[PDB]
Amino acid sequence: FPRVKNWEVGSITYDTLSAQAQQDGPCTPRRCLGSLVFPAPEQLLSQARDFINQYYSSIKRSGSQAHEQRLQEVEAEVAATGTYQLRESELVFGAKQAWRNAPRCVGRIQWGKLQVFDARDCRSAQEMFTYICNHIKYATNRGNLRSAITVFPQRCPGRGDFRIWNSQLVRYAGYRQQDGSVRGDPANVEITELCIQHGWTPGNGRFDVLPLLLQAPDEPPELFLLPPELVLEVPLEHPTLEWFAALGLRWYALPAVSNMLLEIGGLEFPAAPFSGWYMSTQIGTRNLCDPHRYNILEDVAVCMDLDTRTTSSLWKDKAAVEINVAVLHSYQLAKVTIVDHHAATASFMKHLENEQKARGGCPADWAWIVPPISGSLTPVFHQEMVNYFLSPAFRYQPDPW
Amino acid sequence: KFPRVKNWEVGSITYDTLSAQAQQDGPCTPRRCLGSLVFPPEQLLSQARDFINQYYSSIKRSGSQAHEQRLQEVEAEVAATGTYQLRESELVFGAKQAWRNAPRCVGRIQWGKLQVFDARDCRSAQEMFTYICNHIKYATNRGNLRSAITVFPQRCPGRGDFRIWNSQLVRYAGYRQQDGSVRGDPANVEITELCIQHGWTPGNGRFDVLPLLLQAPDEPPELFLLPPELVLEVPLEHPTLEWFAALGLRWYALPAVSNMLLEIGGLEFPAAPFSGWYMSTQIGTRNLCDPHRYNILEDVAVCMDLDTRTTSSLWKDKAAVEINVAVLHSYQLAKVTIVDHHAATASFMKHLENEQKARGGCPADWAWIVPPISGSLTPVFHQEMVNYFLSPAFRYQPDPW
Ligand code: HEM
Ligand code: HEM
Ligand SMILES: C[C@H](O)[C@H](O)[C@H]1CNc2nc(N)[nH]c(=O)c2N1
Ligand SMILES: C[C@H](O)[C@H](O)[C@H]1CNc2nc(N)[nH]c(=O)c2N1
Ligand SMILES: [Cl-]
Ligand SMILES: [Cl-]
Ligand SMILES: [Gd]
Ligand SMILES: [Gd]
Ligand SMILES: [Gd]
Ligand SMILES: [Zn+2]
Numbered sequence: 155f156p157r158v159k160n161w162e163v164g165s166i167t168y169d170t171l172s173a174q175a176q177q178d179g180p181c182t183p184r185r186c187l188g189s190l191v192f193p194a195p196e197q198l199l200s201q202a203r204d205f206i207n208q209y210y211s212s213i214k215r216s217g218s219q220a221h222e223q224r225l226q227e228v229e230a231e232v233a234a235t236g237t238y239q240l241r242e243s244e245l246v247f248g249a250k251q252a253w254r255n256a257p258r259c260v261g262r263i264q265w266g267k268l269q270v271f272d273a274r275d276c277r278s279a280q281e282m283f284t285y286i287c288n289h290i291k292y293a294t295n296r297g298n299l300r301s302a303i304t305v306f307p308q309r310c311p312g313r314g315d316f317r318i319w320n321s322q323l324v325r326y327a328g329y330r331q332q333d334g335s336v337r338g339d340p341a342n343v344e345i346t347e348l349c350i351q352h353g354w355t356p357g358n359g360r361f362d363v364l365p366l367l368l369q370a371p372d373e374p375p376e377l378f379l380l381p382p383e384l385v386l387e388v389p390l391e392h393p394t395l396e397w398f399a400a401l402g403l404r405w406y407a408l409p410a411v412s413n414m415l416l417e418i419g420g421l422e423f424p425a426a427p428f429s430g431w432y433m434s435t436q437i438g439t440r441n442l443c444d445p446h447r448y449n450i451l452e453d454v455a456v457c458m459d460l461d462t463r464t465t466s467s468l469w470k471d472k473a474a475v476e477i478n479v480a481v482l483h484s485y486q487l488a489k490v491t492i493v494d495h496h497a498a499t500a501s502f503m504k505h506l507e508n509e510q511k512a513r514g515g516c517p518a519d520w521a522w523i524v525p526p527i528s529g530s531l532t533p534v535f536h537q538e539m540v541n542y543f544l545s546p547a548f549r550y551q552p553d554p555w
Numbered sequence: 556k557f558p559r560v561k562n563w564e565v566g567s568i569t570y571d572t573l574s575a576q577a578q579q580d581g582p583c584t585p586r587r588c589l590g591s592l593v594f595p596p597e598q599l600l601s602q603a604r605d606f607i608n609q610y611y612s613s614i615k616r617s618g619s620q621a622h623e624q625r626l627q628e629v630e631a632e633v634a635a636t637g638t639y640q641l642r643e644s645e646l647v648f649g650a651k652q653a654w655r656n657a658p659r660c661v662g663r664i665q666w667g668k669l670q671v672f673d674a675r676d677c678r679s680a681q682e683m684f685t686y687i688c689n690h691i692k693y694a695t696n697r698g699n700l701r702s703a704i705t706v707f708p709q710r711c712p713g714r715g716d717f718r719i720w721n722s723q724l725v726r727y728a729g730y731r732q733q734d735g736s737v738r739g740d741p742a743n744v745e746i747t748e749l750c751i752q753h754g755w756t757p758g759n760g761r762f763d764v765l766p767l768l769l770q771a772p773d774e775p776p777e778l779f780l781l782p783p784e785l786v787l788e789v790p791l792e793h794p795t796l797e798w799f800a801a802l803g804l805r806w807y808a809l810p811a812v813s814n815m816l817l818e819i820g821g822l823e824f825p826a827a828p829f830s831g832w833y834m835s836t837q838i839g840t841r842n843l844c845d846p847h848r849y850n851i852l853e854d855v856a857v858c859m860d861l862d863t864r865t866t867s868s869l870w871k872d873k874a875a876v877e878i879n880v881a882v883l884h885s886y887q888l889a890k891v892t893i894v895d896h897h898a899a900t901a902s903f904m905k906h907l908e909n910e911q912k913a914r915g916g917c918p919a920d921w922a923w924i925v926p927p928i929s930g931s932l933t934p935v936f937h938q939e940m941v942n943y944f945l946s947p948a949f950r951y952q953p954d955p956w
Contacts, residue, residue: 156582156589162846172587180558181583181590185574186942187558188583188590189921434867439931446564451932465897466835466883471876471929475869482867496866520591521921526931528872530840531852535927541588 158515162536171515175542176204188541189521192550195232198420201545202228202238205419208251208546209244237310240418246270248418248546249303253428254509255544258522260498260534261430263505269293269302276306279368279376282316282425286366287384289427290323294386294408299431299491305416306425316425317554319367319375320345323410323427324385327362338362340446348555352377360448361387361404369554388488392480397457401450405437405481407490415551424551431491433498438478439526450477474527495525499532506537517542560916564937571916577943579950590942591922594951596712599638599821603629606820606947609652610645638711640675641819647671649819650704653947654829655910659923661899661935662831664906665702670694672705680769680777683707683717683826687767687813688785690828691724695787695809698891700832706817707826717826718955720768720776721746724811724828725786728763739763741847749956753778761849762805764788770955789889793881798858804851806838806882808891816952825952832892834899839879840927851878875928896926900933907938918943 155168180187187193203225210221231238240248254265269292273285289304306316321342327349328342336343338360345364350356354365354377363385367375386407392398410429415422443451451473455462458476460469478494485492493501502523509516518539529535557570582595589595607629611622625642632639641649647669655666670693674686686705694703707717722743729737729744737744739761747765751757755766755778764786770776787808793799810833817827844852852874856863859877861870879895886893894902903924910917919940930936 156587156592159593161593164847169587175586178585179588180585181588182585183580183583184577184943185558185571186581186583186588186590188588188942189940190558191561191563191939443932444564444937446937465901466887466895468876468880468883468895468897470897470932471879474929474932475872475876478872479869482869486867494867494869496871500866521925524922524930526936527929528869528875529925529930530845530927531871531875536845536847538592541590542586 156540158538158540160533160537162533167510167515169515169540171509171513171544172517172540172542174544175517176201176545177543177547179541179543188519195236198237199229199232201420202232205244205248205546209247212247237308237421240421242272245272245274245305245418249305249416249426249428251544252416252418252546252548253303255517255546256548257517257519257541257543260433260502260523260525261493263501263508264301264430265505267301269300271302271304273304273306274308276316277370279370279373279378282306282318282368282370283366283378286318286323286368286427287381289429290380290384290408290410293410293429294384297386297407297488297490299407299429301428301430303416303426303428305423307423309422309424314371314373315369316371317369317375318412318425318427319348319369319554320364321411321413323366323412323429324380324406324408325364326360326406327357327364329356329358339441339448344553348375349377360402363406375554386490388484388490390480390484391487392476393483395458395476395480398454398476398480401453403442403448403450405432405441407432407485409436413551413553415549416546417549418546428548431493432485433493433495433525434478434482434485435495435525435527438481439474442477442481443474471527478527495528495532499523499525499534503533503537515540517544558941560939560941562938564934569911569916571941573910573914573916573918573945574941574943576945577918578946579944579948581942581944590920596637597633600630600633602821602946603633603639606649607645609947610648613648638709638822639820641709641822643673646673646675646706646819649947650706650817650827650829653817653819653949654704656918656945656948658918658920658942658944661834661903661924661926662894663917664902664909665831666906668702670701670703672703674705674707675709677707677717679771680774680779683719683769683771684767684779687719687724687769687828688782690830691781691785691809691811694811694830695785698787698808698889700809700830700892702829702831704817704827704829706824708824710823710825715772715774717772718770719813719826719828720749720770720955721765722812722814724767724813724830725781725807725809726765727807728758728760728765730757730759740842740849750778761803762788764807787891789885789891791881791885792888793877794884796859796877796881799855799877799881802851802854802858804843804849804881806833806842808886808889810837814952814954815949817947818950819947829949832894833886834894834896834926835879835882835886836896836926836928839882840875843878843882844875879928896929897933900924900926900935904934904938916941918945 180193293302326339327346328338366378369375390403412427416426455469455473461467520539582589629639690705727740729739767779768776791804811830813828817824856874862868921940
């Protein structure tokens with residue numbers, strides 16, 4: 155049982171939950187690969203049985219008649235059909251637990267407050283589109299964002315998967331350029347190229363919202379345009395740098411990850427988009443300042459009249475701080491939910507304490523929890539963490555193309 | 556079986572083939588990653604043959620006259636006496652390798668330039684003091700810092716060891732009060748308590764340089780007042796915030812780690828103080844702003860008239876950047892070598908590239924290479940890394956009590 159120290163306070167805890175880690179990660183006693191971004195009815199029965207056990211523990215009915223009856227129903231369904239169906243309440247519990255178990259999520263204090271939309275009866279790409287529009291609308295809630303997930307039908311033998319080809323429901327186009335550069339978000343070049351290939355007439359601005367490419371089973375993807383009035387956006391200004399508005403920068407309200415696989419009790423849902431609300435460093439530091447994204451840092455630091463010829467002036471650090479101030483202020487001004495990296499990491503420390511009492515530990519990926527500016531200024535930096543895989547889970551999956 | 560390692564800024568891929576040599580098994584398993592934790596008789600001949608082979612490979616002299624001969628005498632030495640003495644050049648070559656293998660050192664671009672002071676003929680805390688005093692004055696060099704390591708006698712069975720009871724050669728005192736809390740450095744409250752207990756006059760200051768506690772084999776320690784003209788210190792001022800100097804802050808010139816255990820070819824040196832020069836975040840962000848260190852962050856924000864009532868003003872981030880600006884400006888004005896975190900991480904990326912060609916990879920600890928401020932603004936944030944233990948190495952060791 156790993157002992158875990160907080161260095162700011164001196165406290166010490168042991169992670170007993172890690173002992174229950176189901177799947178395996180990329181590290182060995184030889185070598186740690188923690189910093190890497192990307193690390194049969196009987197085994198289906200085994201995962202199912204474990205999840206049903208989890209479910210009946212949560213409702214204080216472990217070992218009950220209804221518990222044994224459900225184990226039997228699942229075994230019989232897996233024997234007759236090679237798969238099984240989740241009850242509605244098992245689905246809700248399973249989606250919340252997947253969030254709870256996500257080691258790279260700093261927002262998990264909120265895990266119990268999740269709106270689960272059961273789209274497991276979805277029939278086509280066209281119905282998928284309507285469900286997704288309802289998700290964006292409910293989650294955005296006119297700027298008072300609400301956490302939600304929409305669960306589309308599970309993977310099942312004899313039929314292809316539902317897939318959302320887009321990595322998030324709202325993303326900006328990235329157009330490869332005349333002179334080899336990228337106009338717009340360079341992270342989205344490939345999906346942008348796929349949209350045009352599938353009939354989209356491109357724009358040529360830097361913040362053009364992409365269409366949705368939605369795949370129903372055994373069907374090519376289908377293009378759907380998001381209704382403009384469903385996509386709430388925030389123009390970026392700075393509270394005291396008035397030329398900052400003239401950069402023409404914007405970002406969208408809703409972060410809705412749409413390319414990850416939800417696993418519950420051995421069942422796999424390849425289409426199950428989820429959304430919370432932004433932490434300011436995602437927009438301010440990563441999306442805008444990463445050299446391979448919008449890469450605005452030097453341009454802002456010149457406008458700030460910082461001395462960009464020497465690194466020891468800390469011009470990068472000064473420009474980045476003001477970009478993050480601009481993001482926070484603009485979202486507050488527009489009345490769109492946002493959390494700064496200090497508030498978020500402080501709430502995550504409370505989550506770690508809740509989870510130590512409840513489950514004896516908490517899976518956490520230190521390199522993802524610690525914000526990408528002002529790391530040691532936040533309490534998570536001084537907190538040792540144990541990273542491991544629990545199920546239910548959100549997993550990465552390969553791109554459909 | 557050779558980890559694929561990606562840089563996400565550029566898209567470039569390499570394979571760490573050097574990882575195949577990792578000896579001292581780390582703390583990670585396929586079940587859980589512990590990469591964020593701070594602290595995780597003729598076996599001597601095996602690590603001797605291994606290290607000697609390392610020596611002769613490095614000079615294009617494997618499988619040649621001189622190579623065999625040195626294999627024999629270490630075998631004879633350990634047969635006749637149970638251990639062996641290192642050749643002068645091997646001690647030099649081993650010191651540089653243990654540096655080059657330190658996964659947590661961002662400074663390793665400098666690893667080939669190292670001055671090795673051979674103190675193996677030492678005996679007693681009076682001799683130690685002069686050797687340490689030679690090191691300090693040499694390494695400081697009037698502020699033109701030079702990397703240096705002083706190797707005190709190797710450990711042998713049946714007789715006590717050489718140890719420096721201080722974690723560094725220059726540390727500041729930490730004094731409790733009528734209420735537990737500390738004037739001075741809270742990281743050194745313990746050794747301050749030991750020094751005062753061992754016959755030292757406590758100061759009344761937040762920046763009193765502690766005395767050395769030097770221990771010869773099987774004998775108690777002895778206190779040694781460090782020659783004040785040998786302890787180069789830098790008063791901290793800001794280039795434009797005129798009141799910053801009035802805060803009365805200072806830091807010392809020389810970072811001289813004196814509690815680690817140099818291990819070469821199976822031999823163990825529990826007293827082998829090494830020293831390089833500071834990266835400015837070490838002082839300005841960790842030493843001054845950590846909540847459990849000098850904890851000055853809010854005092855500086857009051858002085859800057861920042862709104863400390865809301866976390867979303869990023870008042871912590873702004874105060875922190877200016878504290879780091881003051882450190883860099885102050886050391887440069889005093890003409891004491893120092894490197895900012897942008898220049899240091901840039902040079903590390905160059906080191907990674909060099910080590911890729913030279914040895915097929917480099918052991919790096921992502922959580923320690925990435926600076927404690929502005930992490931994703933430096934190139935190392937976007938570089939995946941493999942951590943593993945190679946020998947020769949610096950290792951941690953328990954306090955001598
Ligand atoms: C309520 C507010 C929420 C906040 C503030 C938040 C915060 C974050 C942040 C900052 C990241 C790192 C993302 C990145 O750097 O790309 C992250 C990752 C993640 N979050 Fe949360 N999150 C929230 C809600 C949710 C919800 C509702 C779910 C699912 C039900 C979820 C599941 C995940 C997962 C699976 C990841 C890993 C995704 C990846 O590796 O790219 N989060 N979260
Ligand atoms: C010359 C310029 C150097 C720079 C700029 C530099 C920078 C750093 C930094 C910032 C750390 C992190 C330590 C911490 O956060 O407490 C570190 C760790 C370390 N360095 Fe270097 N260093 C230098 C020279 C050296 C030398 C000369 C040696 C040994 C010969 C060395 C070996 C190590 C070791 C063993 C650690 C790990 C210390 C620990 O875990 O407590 N470095 N270095
Ligand atoms: C190489 C490194 O793993 C990579 O840059 C990671 C580091 N930490 C991160 N942390 C978060 N929250 N999001 C990220 O995309 C990353 N990227
Ligand atoms: C908990 C965590 O491992 C701890 O705070 C580490 C993180 N990374 C670090 N990195 C460096 N260079 N120095 C440190 O002291 C630490 N502290
Ligand atoms: Cl995003
Ligand atoms: Cl230090
Ligand atoms: Gd202004
Ligand atoms: Gd411009
Ligand atoms: Gd004033
Ligand atoms: Zn690991």
